[PDB]
Every structure is written in C-alpha cells, then in structure tokens.
Design a protein around this ligand. Structure first.
Ligand SMILES: [Mg+2]
Ligand SMILES: [Mg+2]
Ligand SMILES: [Mg+2]
Ligand SMILES: [Mg+2]
Ligand SMILES: [Mg+2]
Ligand SMILES: [Mg+2]
Ligand SMILES: [Mg+2]
Ligand SMILES: [Mg+2]
Ligand SMILES: [Mg+2]
Ligand SMILES: [Mg+2]
Ligand SMILES: [Mg+2]
Ligand SMILES: [Mg+2]
Ligand SMILES: [Mg+2]
Ligand SMILES: [Mg+2]
Ligand SMILES: [Mg+2]
Ligand SMILES: [Mg+2]
Ligand SMILES: [Mg+2]
Ligand SMILES: [Mg+2]
Ligand SMILES: [Mg+2]
Ligand SMILES: [Mg+2]
Ligand SMILES: [Mg+2]
Ligand SMILES: [Mg+2]
Ligand SMILES: [Mg+2]
Ligand SMILES: [Mg+2]
Ligand SMILES: [Mg+2]
Ligand SMILES: [Mg+2]
Ligand SMILES: [Mg+2]
Ligand SMILES: [Mg+2]
Ligand SMILES: [Mg+2]
Ligand SMILES: [Mg+2]
Ligand SMILES: [Mg+2]
Ligand SMILES: [Mg+2]
Ligand SMILES: [Mg+2]
Ligand SMILES: [Mg+2]
Ligand SMILES: [Mg+2]
Ligand SMILES: [Mg+2]
Ligand SMILES: [Mg+2]
Ligand SMILES: [Mg+2]
Ligand SMILES: [Mg+2]
Ligand SMILES: [Mg+2]
Ligand SMILES: [Mg+2]
Ligand SMILES: [Mg+2]
Ligand SMILES: [Mg+2]
Ligand SMILES: [Mg+2]
Ligand SMILES: [Mg+2]
Ligand SMILES: [Mg+2]
Ligand SMILES: [Mg+2]
Ligand SMILES: [Mg+2]
Ligand SMILES: [Mg+2]
Ligand SMILES: [Mg+2]
Ligand SMILES: [Mg+2]
Ligand SMILES: [Mg+2]
Ligand SMILES: [Mg+2]
Ligand SMILES: [Mg+2]
Ligand SMILES: [Mg+2]
Ligand SMILES: [Mg+2]
Ligand SMILES: [Mg+2]
Ligand SMILES: [Mg+2]
Ligand SMILES: [Mg+2]
Ligand SMILES: [Mg+2]
Ligand SMILES: [Mg+2]
Ligand SMILES: [Mg+2]
Ligand SMILES: [Mg+2]
Ligand SMILES: [Mg+2]
Ligand SMILES: [Mg+2]
Ligand SMILES: [Mg+2]
Ligand SMILES: [Mg+2]
Ligand SMILES: [Mg+2]
Ligand SMILES: [Mg+2]
Ligand SMILES: [Mg+2]
Ligand SMILES: [Mg+2]
Lengths: 156, 53, 148, 185, 222, 51
RNA sequence: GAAAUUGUUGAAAGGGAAGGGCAUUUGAUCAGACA
RNA sequence: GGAAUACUGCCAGCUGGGACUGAGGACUGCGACGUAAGUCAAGGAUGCUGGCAUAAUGGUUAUAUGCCGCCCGUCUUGAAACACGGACCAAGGAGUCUAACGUCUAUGCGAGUGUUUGGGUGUAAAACCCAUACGCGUAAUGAAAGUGAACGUAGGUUGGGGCCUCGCAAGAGGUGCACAAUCGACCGAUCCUGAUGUCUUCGGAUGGAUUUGAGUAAGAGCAUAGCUGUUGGGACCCGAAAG
RNA sequence: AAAUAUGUAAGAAGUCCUUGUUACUUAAUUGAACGUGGACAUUUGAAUGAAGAGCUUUUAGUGGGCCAUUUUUGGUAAGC
RNA sequence: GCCCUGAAAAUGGAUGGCGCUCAAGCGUGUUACCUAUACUCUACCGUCAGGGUUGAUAUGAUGCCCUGACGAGUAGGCAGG
C-alpha cells in the first residue's frame, strides 16, 4: 500500500436541517410610494426615465408604466429601492391594473396581449396626465443630475 | 467578647432566639433631619492674603 | 536510544541547553572531589558530614570470615523446618519428641530474639544466642544446644 | 490583558490513566471508571485512582498486615481489598478465613490465604460481588518504608542517612559526625 | 410509560406557578421602589417646609469600574484590585459600602471609577451583561431557572430577585453579588469627557468617586 | 448557543420577568406623581439667597 | 550530471543600492466546482 | 399670582437610516400571541429574483502604487553600530560511548531476588535448560572487646479516605489502612544503679538519665530497561605559552 | 512625637462545669501539667476574595545587571 | 504677565519638516472628531478545566459529545511531532 488507510471513516449520511424559524412577513413600502406617483428610475435599461407607479406586486416589485407612448417605457417591474419617489401624483383610480401579477411576467416578438394591455392602461393614464399641463412633457424627459445638484438636499 | 457572646446567646435562647452576634464593621449612617431652631447657617468666605511679622 | 534523547531536541538552538552566559566549559569546580575543604565545603558538611579525618582503630589484614555470623530472629526460626514437616511439629508440640533445628546447618551463627514463637517445644542447635532469644525458647519448653 | 492570579494552563497534577501499558490493567480501569461514573459509591472512585498508581505509591500489603486488619472491632468478615500485590509473611502463625481481593497474590500469599480456607479474588470479581464495594476493607501498604525516603531531607541535625556506597567506619563518621572531630552534624 | 403529556404537565403547570410567584414578587418590589423613592422626595420637601434640612443616608452600595490597564501597578492596590475582582480594564463589580471596604476603595482610587448606581443602571447591567459563576464556568443569566438553581438557597429565584437583593443590599448580598461574574463592559461609547483619564474626577479627570455621575458613564460603556 | 439581550429582544424580556407585560400595559414608566403644595420656610429661602 | 558561477534566447523593472511585510490594480499562468 | 421653558434623570414609549456577522443542523428548552385551531421575531438565516457557468470568482506569480521594514550570528546593562565572524556554493562538520551512581517510571518475581563465571543443549556467537556458590536484601549499633529489638490487641492521644450501623434526608455513632503531629515502650552506645552468686574479683540481674545511633515497633526488596542528573574517562567540538 | 511601614489576636485545636494521675510542687489532694465524665452548632462569632488546599522528590539556567519616581550617602559636578 | 536686553564657537540645518502673527504662538474654557496587538460582541485554532457517554445490530474509548476560562517571552525545562 502507498498509504495506510484511516482507522475511522466519516458517515456519508447528510443530516437534516434544524427546523429554522424565519417567517416570510409582508414588506410595507415607504410611505412615499403610493400608486399614481411619478418615479425617477435610478438604474437599469430605463435609467433616468420618469415613470408612473401602478401596483405593488407580490414579489415586492413595483408595477409601472411609462406611459409607453409618452417615453417608451412599457408596463414593467422595477425594484422599490432603485427608484426616487417624487412628490407628484396622478390619480390611478380609473386604471384596472388588477389583471397584473408575477405570473404575468413568466419569462419562459411581443405577446399581442401585452401590446394590448399596454394600450388600455396608457389610455387611462394619459386621460389623467393631460389634466395637469406640462406633466406629459415632464414624463417625456429623462432626469439627470446637473452640476450643483445635491441629492441629499433636493426635494423631488 | 466570647463570655459576652455566650451570654446574650443564652439570654436570647431562653428568650425567643433572634440574636445576630458577629461583629459587623462601621456601617454608613442613616437619613436624618437637622434643625434650625437655634441654628441658622453662618456663611463663611475665604480670606485675603496677610502677613503679621 | 539516541532517538529518545534530549540532545535531538536541542538541535537548532544555539547553546545546547547550557546557557549563553555561563556556557559549558571544561571543568569549573576543579575535577573530582577537589576543594572539599574549600569551595565545595558547603556541599560536603550536609550530605556528607563526617567525611574528613579519622576515627577508630586500624586493623591490618582483617579477614572477613573471622567475623562470619549471620543472625536469625525467633521471628523466623520456624521457617527452617520445611512447611509440610512444620505442622507435623506445630501440632504435637512436646517434650520427648520436639523438632531439632540446626541453625548453623541453615547457615546462621547467632539467634536473636525479635519476638514471639508459638508455645511449642523446639530443640535449637546454634553457635550463639542472645540472652532473650534463649529465654523465649525455654518459655515454649525448648532448649538451646550450643554447637560448632 | 488580565492581571492573572494563578498560573495559566496548569495541568491537574493527578494521573488520569495508569502510566502502565498492560491491557488487563487498562481493562480493570475500564470497568471501574464505568462503576465510578454510575454508582455514586465513593469506594469505586477511590479504586479507580489507585489503579493509576505507580509502583512506589503501591507498596505491598502483607498477609499479616491483613490478619491484623481483620482483628479490628467488627471487621473479621469484611472482605479486604488491595490495589497492589499481596505478599506472604512467615511470621504470622494463625491466619483467618476471609476474602482478599487484589491485583496480584504472590505464590506464598495466595497459598497461606487459601490454606486457611480463604479466597483470592481479582478486582473484577470483587466488582461483580460488590458493585458499591459493600462490606469492603481497603488496605494500603507502607509507602514510607521505601529505602529511598531514608535519604530525602538530608541536612545538618536532621539525622537521615548519607547517600553512601560502602559503609562502616572510615565512611563519613569523623569530622562533622562527632564532638571530637571538629563538630557534630 | 406515561409522561407523554403526563409529567410534561406536572412540570409545565408547576412552571406556571413559578412565573406566578415571580410576577407578584416583581410587582411588589416595584411598589417598594416607588414608595421608597417618593418617601425621600417628600422627606426633603417636608423638611424645607419645616425650616430644616433632610440629609439622605450615605449610600450603601457603589459600583466600581477598573479604569487603568494591567501594568505598572504597585503591590497593595494591585492586590486589592484582585480582591474586588477587577483584574482587567473596564470590567466592574458592585461593592457594599462599609468602613472595611471603604478603606479598600480608598486604596485604589487612582485606577478605578465609581459612584452610586441607579436602579436603571443595575437593571441594564444585569439584563444585558449578567452572568453567573456556576462551577466557575461563567454562565449567562438569560433564564430564571439558572438563578433559582443557585441563588435559590437564599430566596431569590429570578433575574429581578437578583437585582433587588443587589440594589437594596439585602441580608444575602455577599452571596447574591458574588454570584455575578464581574461585569465586562466596553469603552464608554462617546468617550470619557475628559482629555486625561488618570486624575481625580474633581480635577477634571476620570478616576475617583464621581457619585451619581457613575451612571452616565457605565451606560456609555454598557 | 447565542445570548439574546432582553432590553432589545422583546421575546426574552417576557421569558424573564412576567411583570413587564403589565409594566408596559400600565405605562408605569411614566407614572404621574400626585401633586402637593408644601412650600419651604422663609429661613430656607432667606439663607439660600444670603451671601 | 545539483549548486555557486557563465553564454545565448524570451519576458520585465530600474532619477544615489537591492531584497522584505499588509493590501490591491495590471499582465502572465492555473486548480476546482458546475451539469 | 399662574403658567412656560432650560437643565438633570427615568420609561419593560414609538420609530427611520447604515454597517459587520448567519456559528449550529431532526426533535427535545424557557416562553410569546390566540376563545380556540393554530401562529411566532421564543435553545444561532431564511425566502424570493437575477447573472456567469467560466479565468467570471479564486490561487499562484511578475510589476506598479499607499503605508511600513537597518545585517544576521554573538558577547553584552546596552549592537543597525565607527564591536567580532561571515565574498559565493556543495559536501563534511560538534553532549557520544563506557564504568559506578541519585531521583523517577515501566516490567518480572517477592522476604526474597539475580538463567548467560560455568555446565547442559543446539536448526550453533541465537533460542532452550541448569547444580553449587556468590552478590545485594531480610538487624541494628560501638573506636572496639561486644551486645542485639513486644509491659501493652506491637501502646496512648489528635486529624484521617474508605467501610460498617441508625436515619426518608440531614445528620449521628462504630471502625479506622496510608500519611501527618505528639507522648511513650524496645535494641545498641554513653553515664548511673550494682540483687542472687562468686576460682576475692570475677559476675552484671535489676531499675534509672536535659545524652546518643544511617535502628525496632506484622518486612520491601532484588533484577532488567528508559529519560534526566552525577563522577572518572580525549568526555560537546576546535585552541596555548609550555613540559 | 507623627505619616508610611511592623508583632499578635478575631473560637470546635472553642468557652465553661464535674474531679482522676504523678516520683514534680504546696503548710496542705495545695498547685502544675495530661486526662475521664457533662453543658452550648453554624450570625460557630469581622470584611473581601479563593479556576481549591496541603505535601514530597528531583533537576536546568542564573549567581557582570541596568533604568524611572520617591527616600538617600560621597562628590562643585557628571549620561559619575 | 507676555515681550525685549542681559545671550560668545567652530561643515549648512533644524518647534520633526513646510510654514504660521485677531496663529498654525502663550494661558484657560467648551464641543466634535482621528486611531493600539488594549476594551466589547462574534467566528476559527490551540491549552487547561469541569460534565456526559461501552448499549449492541458498523468504522478511532489514547475516542465521541457538552460547557467555561486562558494565549508575551531570552536562559532554561518539558511535551507532541
Ligand atoms: Mg416557525
Ligand atoms: Mg416592513
Ligand atoms: Mg418620447
Ligand atoms: Mg544513556
Ligand atoms: Mg534511537
Ligand atoms: Mg525524535
Ligand atoms: Mg527543547
Ligand atoms: Mg521548543
Ligand atoms: Mg529544533
Ligand atoms: Mg530557547
Ligand atoms: Mg541543561
Ligand atoms: Mg555560546
Ligand atoms: Mg578520605
Ligand atoms: Mg527479621
Ligand atoms: Mg529496613
Ligand atoms: Mg503613571
Ligand atoms: Mg465585591
Ligand atoms: Mg451614546
Ligand atoms: Mg452623539
Ligand atoms: Mg464616534
Ligand atoms: Mg492631550
Ligand atoms: Mg454599548
Ligand atoms: Mg556526463
Ligand atoms: Mg517576467
Ligand atoms: Mg501580493
Ligand atoms: Mg447556517
Ligand atoms: Mg450553519
Ligand atoms: Mg477552469
Ligand atoms: Mg466571463
Ligand atoms: Mg515582489
Ligand atoms: Mg521607513
Ligand atoms: Mg561575540
Ligand atoms: Mg561593554
Ligand atoms: Mg546584532
Ligand atoms: Mg557608532
Ligand atoms: Mg572578540
Ligand atoms: Mg571579516
Ligand atoms: Mg556564512
Ligand atoms: Mg550537510
Ligand atoms: Mg558458534
Ligand atoms: Mg533442554
Ligand atoms: Mg556442580
Ligand atoms: Mg552482606
Ligand atoms: Mg563485656
Ligand atoms: Mg558487629
Ligand atoms: Mg497521652
Ligand atoms: Mg466519625
Ligand atoms: Mg475512637
Ligand atoms: Mg535505650
Ligand atoms: Mg555515644
Ligand atoms: Mg545502615
Ligand atoms: Mg542497609
Ligand atoms: Mg564529565
Ligand atoms: Mg591541542
Ligand atoms: Mg603544545
Ligand atoms: Mg610543543
Ligand atoms: Mg613544569
Ligand atoms: Mg498589618
Ligand atoms: Mg467567594
Ligand atoms: Mg474551586
Ligand atoms: Mg534548583
Ligand atoms: Mg549555582
Ligand atoms: Mg559570569
Ligand atoms: Mg517606571
Ligand atoms: Mg528653540
Ligand atoms: Mg506641526
Ligand atoms: Mg490654546
Ligand atoms: Mg465640529
Ligand atoms: Mg486582534
Ligand atoms: Mg507561549
Ligand atoms: Mg506565560
């Protein structure tokens, strides 16, 4: 023999996990996040795009729309923590939205359903947007920090 | 102290136990009230420099 | 064996476990019993009081043998009878038939008295006895028979 | 840091196994720790210790020193235990019945014991017979009768046997040992 | 074999009894505490009223914190430091005040900080860094049965019984206080307030009897 | 295996000390002491404002 | 057919030595583990 | 007159942001919330989603950059020293063996112990066997001639593990090895006493004493082996001027 | 005549009572010493602490020391 | 009190350097802040200590398991390798 065989071997039995105690309790979003609120997108494909908060989905994400025909952003998920929640609010009280959930975004060009869904939500919002003037343009435009801007001081 | 202890031990036994006869050290003193009947605080100040010589 | 030896362990340490100040030099005390009366007297009185000087008579051409005289105490005595033979005698302890024991034949010269033998007659042949040894024997009802 | 107040990492200073390498001993010890651990009988942990004892702290018990012990008041039916060898003593003439349990009986010791209608018992049989050492009498031999302790404590006025080879006069019995040769001890 | 729920009960219920006992006992001390506290407050007023002066009893309990490191300490203080179980920096113990410990404290002023500790701070001492000496071993308090286990001999069968026997300096304070391993706290959080530690409190440094000001510290370090 | 602070961890607060439930329930931490009038002898204030 | 030490080739660094420690950039090189 | 506020302190009042950590691996505990079923933040991290599946992470290495880093060895109170040795590399290169020992340990046998001078025998320097002695031990003490260890359950007293007895337990008593303290008895030396007796100077019982011994008082030894220590040896290695 | 420093004591090996032993000692069963028998338990006799206490054997290195605050001698002084 | 005079040495040179003048100087107060191999909490290694566990029908009993406290080091000792 090259080497002399241990006198004791480990069990190759794997133990079972201790019965962990970590209840998945619901996430209460910051008070500043309320459906109909305009959001600044801090990251991502649509970084800096300004956008409407719609529904808090069951996987913690936020549902938003652009609306698409204003700034090109479709109904979409967005993570609540990459998001500056402004102070400007449009009523979302005529926007069904309850259709929309996690399964709706099952990864698994673009489903005619989506293309449809998109138009139905955006029409409601535009109806609204178009009330306050210049909101539509506001939403059209990207956000950027200028020289002099100090995030820890600007009101949004 | 022994002679004394044996005493107030039998003095206590023949009574109804209740002794306590180890020496304890100086305890801090208790609350108390000081009167002013006949006694208002006289106020002192420090005194200037002098010599006498 | 070398392998269990503390020098093996000192390898790599500069001074072999012998000090850097005080070193391991050849013979600081002197050699042998040098200075027994000087730099080594403290160790000699204590541990070896009595070491220096003379006491007693010189004896030229002494021959141990002259003074050959192993002692045996009554303490044993009964040992010199072989065991099986022994109880034959322990019981039926008596005059008229009591064991003879040649202590010289056993290879002893004197019989001393370290204490108590059963109440049983023995005939004890020896060269010498202590006054007591002999007394004790007679109290069992034995005698001592002087020999050479 | 800590103003320590006691040497850090000190070993208890007591044996924990025998130093010996004898299976049988290692077995006896195996038995007795089990007994010592699960019986709360104090007799067992005493034994468990002694089984670790070095040969020095194990002086022989003589068979006569045994007969004496049984002459104790109310002790003659107890069974003596000896965690060492037991040896024979030509000097006792009457030896009692009893039941001696030990590590070793010399030929003569076991002889004499048995001739008197006794019984030599190994410490493991002692166990099965007396798990709490019921009715046992533990004897120890004379530790200090060793020849070595003769020389321990050597110094002036302590009277304690020189470490000396040849003896007789001419051998450390002059200056320092008598009043007429300088001084005495 | 029963026991299933059977002797699960004879325990569990019997466990309820003890919380019962503890509950009422704690409610009691709370009364004791307020009404003691309040009794002084009204004693001081009642005296001023009467044209006089209420001098509070001198304090029976102090709390000592070793403030100085481990080295270059002269023998007599260093022995005493040990005797009060303060053998490492920032650890700390309670000391019942008599002449015969007062003189101890006296001897080790340049190396410790101490004062009179509030109920608030003895409580948050015991609750958070309270450990028992149990076959040495330094076991965390954290369940009341750990205490009753050992301090129960003396009455005292909860963490709050402990605290109580400590702050009131009870008849069994030696046993109660020794049961607690010397507290091991951190450095004061927002610093010592002084620029140089090893002076008397009075001289603008940190050692000595700083009285009711011990609490403000002991907290920051706890 | 892992010491839990009461003080923080509300659960073990209640493991130790059951009184904590009523303590908090009855505020107590903010006990409103009974208001009394007793005002100090002139001697007191006189010598307070003496020099 | 080791080492000191040498020639060539290749790569790299070098404002009064060089080598070292913790750390990371950069280049070169590589084990594993994945299904 | 009646409030406010500051300051100090308290709350088992509520609540936001940020950072490090996630040891453990069925259950078992102490609890908490529920009318309950049940739930839980209560004896240590889980859930959900994505990206790569490879030099992406990681290791190694070279370089750069921030901070930091004097030459080791040595004697010394104190060396990086304007104290010594050392240009470089390889290979040699220093506590050994023996005689006799102390303590300790392991093992054999035990009042004994040691086969190995020798003999017998042999598969031959082995292994196996063994008569007689010898050695050390089982007796001390005196310079020596010499004498030579129980008043007693081999003594009293005090602590003493363990065992025994009583008690539910606590305790209480009984016995107590080793070991420790103390007072004694025994043997020799020393001094004293000096019976019965006697080759009239032998004999030395007996009872004593701030004396004394490496002693007795129900043996512990002998032998092999090991680490460390001792002494003599070239004696850890290298070194005189000399004779 | 201090301050600092320093001896001893703070109980079970304790305090009492009852009356043995001797050749010591007293005028004296007087005393001294050692006992027998009996009475009182952990608030059994201050504090604090105690990762325990006691004891034994053996052996290394070391036996050039130097520094600080305070006390302090010689020296004008000194990194004396 | 601060400042100035008193106030003289040898290579060029030292509040550590730059430099600072309602200081970046002297006295004194009050806050905040920086950062040790120290303190607090946690993981892991090792040492020492206390517990537990011979019960097969599986693998180390010098083992396995729980728990606590401790860790500087020449000369020197011992241990495990
Ligand atoms: Mg759960
Ligand atoms: Mg939430
Ligand atoms: Mg657009
Ligand atoms: Mg050797
Ligand atoms: Mg070898
Ligand atoms: Mg080796
Ligand atoms: Mg070594
Ligand atoms: Mg080493
Ligand atoms: Mg080495
Ligand atoms: Mg070394
Ligand atoms: Mg050495
Ligand atoms: Mg050297
Ligand atoms: Mg000679
Ligand atoms: Mg004999
Ligand atoms: Mg002997
Ligand atoms: Mg200082
Ligand atoms: Mg204390
Ligand atoms: Mg704070
Ligand atoms: Mg703050
Ligand atoms: Mg801070
Ligand atoms: Mg400062
Ligand atoms: Mg804190
Ligand atoms: Mg060739
Ligand atoms: Mg390169
Ligand atoms: Mg690197
Ligand atoms: Mg985990
Ligand atoms: Mg884990
Ligand atoms: Mg790869
Ligand atoms: Mg890649
Ligand atoms: Mg490099
Ligand atoms: Mg540098
Ligand atoms: Mg040198
Ligand atoms: Mg010099
Ligand atoms: Mg050097
Ligand atoms: Mg120089
Ligand atoms: Mg030289
Ligand atoms: Mg040179
Ligand atoms: Mg070299
Ligand atoms: Mg070599
Ligand atoms: Mg041959
Ligand atoms: Mg044969
Ligand atoms: Mg022959
Ligand atoms: Mg001989
Ligand atoms: Mg004669
Ligand atoms: Mg002789
Ligand atoms: Mg006596
Ligand atoms: Mg008893
Ligand atoms: Mg008795
Ligand atoms: Mg005598
Ligand atoms: Mg003599
Ligand atoms: Mg002798
Ligand atoms: Mg001898
Ligand atoms: Mg030699
Ligand atoms: Mg030569
Ligand atoms: Mg020569
Ligand atoms: Mg020559
Ligand atoms: Mg000559
Ligand atoms: Mg004193
Ligand atoms: Mg204590
Ligand atoms: Mg302890
Ligand atoms: Mg020594
Ligand atoms: Mg010496
Ligand atoms: Mg020297
Ligand atoms: Mg100093
Ligand atoms: Mg200047
Ligand atoms: Mg500066
Ligand atoms: Mg200033
Ligand atoms: Mg500031
Ligand atoms: Mg660290
Ligand atoms: Mg170390
Ligand atoms: Mg150390």
């Amino acid at each position: 023999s090259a080497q002399k065989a241990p006198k004791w071997y480990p069990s190759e039995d794997v133990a079972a996990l201790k019965k962990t105690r970590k209840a998945a309790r619901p996430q209460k979003l910051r008070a500043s996040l309320v459906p109909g609120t305009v959001l600044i997108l801090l990251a991502g494909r649509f970084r800096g795009k300004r956008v409407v908060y719609l529904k808090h989905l069951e996987d913690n994400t936020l549902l938003i729309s652009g609306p698409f025909k204003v700034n090109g952003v479709p109904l979409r998920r967005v993570n609540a923590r990459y998001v500056i929640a402004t102070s400007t609010k449009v009523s979302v009280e005529g926007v069904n939205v309850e259709k929309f959930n996690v399964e709706y975004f099952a990864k698994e060009e673009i489903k005619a359903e989506r293309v449809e869904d998109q138009k139905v939500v955006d029409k409601a919002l535009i109806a609204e947007i178009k009330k306050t003037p210049l909101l539509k343009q506001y939403l059209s435009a990207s956000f950027s920090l200028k020289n002099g801007d100090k995030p820890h001081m600007l009101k949004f | 102290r022994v002679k004394a202890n044996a005493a107030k031990r039998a003095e206590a036994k023949a009574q109804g136990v209740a002794v306590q006869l180890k020496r304890q050290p100086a305890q801090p003193r208790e609350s108390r009230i000081v009167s002013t009947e006949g006694n208002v605080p006289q106020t002192l100040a420090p005194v200037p420099y002098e010599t006498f010589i | 064996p070398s392998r269990f030896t503390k020098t093996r362990k000192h390898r790599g340490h500069v001074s072999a476990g012998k000090g850097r100040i005080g070193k391991h030099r050849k013979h600081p005390g002197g050699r042998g019993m040098a200075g027994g009366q000087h730099h080594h007297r403290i160790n000699m009185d204590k541990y070896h009081p009595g070491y220096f000087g003379k006491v007693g008579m010189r004896y030229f051409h002494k021959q141990q043998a002259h003074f050959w005289k192993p002692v045996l105490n009554l303490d044993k005595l009964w040992t010199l009878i072989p065991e099986d033979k022994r109880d034959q005698y322990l019981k039926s302890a008596s005059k008229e038939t009591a064991p003879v024991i040649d202590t010289l034949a056993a290879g002893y010269g004197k019989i001393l008295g370290k204490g108590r033998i059963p109440n049983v007659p023995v005939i004890v042949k020896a060269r010498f006895v202590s006054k007591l040894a002999e007394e004790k024997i007679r109290a069992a009802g034995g005698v001592v028979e002087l020999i050479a | 840091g800590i103003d320590h107040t006691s040497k850090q990492h000190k070993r208890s200073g007591h044996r924990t196994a025998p130093k010996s390498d004898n299976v049988y001993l290692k077995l006896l010890v195996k038995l007795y720790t089990f007994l010592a651990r699960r019986t709360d009988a104090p007799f067992n942990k005493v034994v468990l210790k002694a089984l670790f004892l070095s040969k020095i702290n194990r002086p022989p018990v003589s068979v006569s020193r045994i007969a004496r012990a049984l002459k104790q008041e109310g002790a003659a039916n107890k069974t003596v235990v000896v965690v060492g060898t037991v040896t024979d003593d030509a000097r006792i003439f009457e030896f009692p019945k009893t039941t001696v349990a030990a590590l070793r009986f010399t030929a003569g010791a076991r002889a004499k014991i048995v001739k008197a209608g006794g019984e030599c018992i190994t410490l493991d049989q002692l166990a099965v017979r007396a798990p709490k050492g019921q009715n046992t009498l533990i004897l120890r031999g004379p530790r200090n009768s060793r020849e070595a302790v003769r020389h321990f404590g050597m110094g002036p006025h302590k009277g304690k046997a020189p470490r000396i080879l040849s003896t007789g006069r001419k051998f450390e019995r002059a200056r320092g040992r008598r009043r007429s040769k300088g001084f005495k001890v | 074999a029963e026991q299933v729920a059977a002797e699960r009960a004879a325990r569990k219920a019997a466990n309820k009894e003890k919380r019962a006992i503890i509950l009422e006992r704690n409610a009691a001390y709370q009364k004791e505490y307020e009404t003691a506290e309040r009794n002084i407050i009204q004693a001081k007023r009642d005296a001023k009223a009467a044209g006089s002066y209420y001098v509070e009893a001198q304090h029976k309990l102090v709390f000592v914190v070793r403030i100085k490191g481990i080295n270059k300490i002269p023998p007599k203080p260093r022995k005493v430091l040990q005797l009060l179980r303060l053998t490492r920096i920032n650890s700390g113990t309670f000391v019942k005040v008599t002449k015969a410990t007062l003189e101890l404290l006296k001897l080790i002023e340049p190396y410790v900080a101490y004062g009179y500790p509030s109920y608030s701070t003895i409580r948050q001492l015991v609750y958070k860094r309270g450990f028992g000496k149990i076959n040495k071993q330094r076991v965390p308090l954290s369940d009341n049965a750990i205490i009753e286990a050992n301090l129960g001999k003396y009455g005292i069968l909860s963490i709050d019984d402990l605290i109580h026997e400590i702050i009131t300096v009870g008849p069994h304070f030696k046993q109660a206080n020794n049961f607690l391993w010397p507290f091991k706290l951190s450095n004061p959080s927002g610093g010592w307030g002084v620029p140089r530690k090893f002076k008397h409190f009075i001289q603008g440094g940190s050692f000595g009897n700083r009285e009711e000001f011990i609490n403000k510290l002991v907290k920051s370090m706890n | 295996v892992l010491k839990k602070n009461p003080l923080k961890n509300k659960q073990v607060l209640l493991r130790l000390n059951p009184y904590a439930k009523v303590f908090a329930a009855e505020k107590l931490g903010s006990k409103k002491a009974e208001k009394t009038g007793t005002k100090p002898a002139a001697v007191f204030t006189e010598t307070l404002k003496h020099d």
